[PDB]
């Protein structure tokens, strides 16, 4: 269990200390979202080719959970259509609240964030980036 806890922590820390897709995209949708209680803030940019998430980057500062989740999300949604990305967001939200471990879609590293469901107050952290995604694609309708 100690090694297993360390393995969960190492996946999350790999995404936190080696974040994927840091930065700001050219010619993109910009969404800002903040979690004032924990103090997490994310700026998600998304380059859409019509309804295709052609690219997605994020900048931010926050806890390990929120920034790791943003890294994993940007990596997971790249190349998907808006509809699929929103389905993935809903699947992840349900997985965070404990409703459905729907592995119909392979969420990869995102599933390590299931650990955070152990502490309910950090669920918001884990979902910050996904909320940004939804705000992003309700902006360009
Ligand atoms: Zn946080």
Swiss-Prot record:
It is an enzyme of class 2 (transferase). Changing residue 38 to D: Complete loss of growth without mevalonate. Its EC number is 2.-.-.-. GO terms for cellular component: cytoplasm. GO terms for biological process: intracellular iron ion homeostasis; iron-sulfur cluster assembly. Changing residue 125 to D: Delayed growth without mevalonate. This is Zinc-dependent sulfurtransferase SufU. The gene is sufU.
